[PDB]
Each structure stands twice: as C-alpha cells, then as structure tokens.
From Swiss-Prot:
The gene is FABP5. GO terms for molecular function: fatty acid binding; identical protein binding; lipid binding; long-chain fatty acid transmembrane transporter activity; retinoic acid binding. The modification Phosphotyrosine is found at Y133. (9Z,12Z)-octadecadienoate binds at R131, I132, Y133. Hexadecanoate binds at Y133. The keyword Transferase does not apply. This is Fatty acid-binding protein 5.
C-alpha cells in the first residue's frame, strides 16, 4: 500500500458507508440488542498520531470510547462491546493495523487512506466488514 504517512490518517472522520458490520459484530459475539445500537449509529472517528503515540476516538451521540497506545507495544484495550483484549497497533506498509487477541480469539482492523476517504476494514475468521469514513472539514 505504497509509502503513505500516518499523518494522512489524522483528524476527524465521519461514517458514510458500511457493509457487513452486523455480520462482523456477530462473529465478535455481540448481542442483538447491542448490534442494533451499534449498526444504527453514525459514529465519528478521531485519529491522532504523534510520532508513534496513537490515539483513536470512536464517538457517537450516545456512546464514546477511545484507546491510546504506542505503535509496536502491546496493551490491554477495552473495546466498545466490552471485550478486554491484548492489542498491538502498527503502521505497516502505509496502513494502520490494529490486531486484537482475547480468549484464544483473533481480530484485525485495518485503516487506510484511499481516494481521500478513510477505509476501515474489520476481519474476524471468514467475516470481513468494510466501513468508509470521509473527512469532516
Ligand atoms: C447506543 C450506542 C451503543 C453503540 C455501541 C455498542 C456496540 C458497539 C459494537 C461493536 C463494536 C465493534 C468494534 C469495531 C468497531 C470498528 C468500527 C470502526 O472503527 O469503524
């Protein structure tokens, strides 16, 4: 994915498209009552990366979560759905890669810039979710 800077990902983004998010949440083990609220939301995403210090805010009018970390160093993340995972974030090959592990399970969220839009790609097992954000200018 070329030689992009992580700075190109920085800033405030807004969801404009989502496909397969409900299927992905299912694979995580999220309850219907929760999946309904999750898929219904039009969240913002605020990404800030100072050198290797990464912070991602996931914000909706009802619920807001965030994580902060150092690229390359594992940390305990509390996800929005309530999972406690061992997560490492890396900016590899021009893409922000968030790898999660918990209870013997695995999931990877990959964020890249493409055609000016933030392309978020969530993967667990055979399930792939693709969510598109655009810059809030
Ligand atoms: C009342 C609203 C409550 C909504 C929150 C509840 C459920 C959240 C659902 C599961 C979170 C899955 C984490 C993956 C997020 C990546 C999506 C993205 O980065 O684009």
């Amino acid at each position: 994915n070329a030689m992009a800077t992580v700075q190109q990902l920085e800033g405030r983004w807004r969801l404009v498209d989502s496909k397969g998010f409900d299927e992905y949440m299912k694979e995580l083990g999220v309850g219907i009552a929760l999946r309904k609220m999750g898929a219904m939301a039009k969240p913002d995403c605020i990404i800030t990366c100072d050198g290797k210090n990464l912070t991602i805010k996931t914000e909706s009018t009802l619920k807001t979560t965030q994580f902060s970390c150092t690229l390359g160093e594992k940390f305990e993340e509390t996800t929005a759905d309530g999972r406690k995972t061992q997560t490492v974030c890396n900016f590899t090959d021009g893409a922000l890669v968030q790898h999660q592990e918990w209870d013997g399970k695995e999931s990877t969220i990959t964020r890249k810039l493409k055609d000016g839009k933030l392309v978020v790609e969530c993967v667990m097992n055979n399930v792939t979710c693709t969510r598109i954000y655009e810059k809030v200018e």
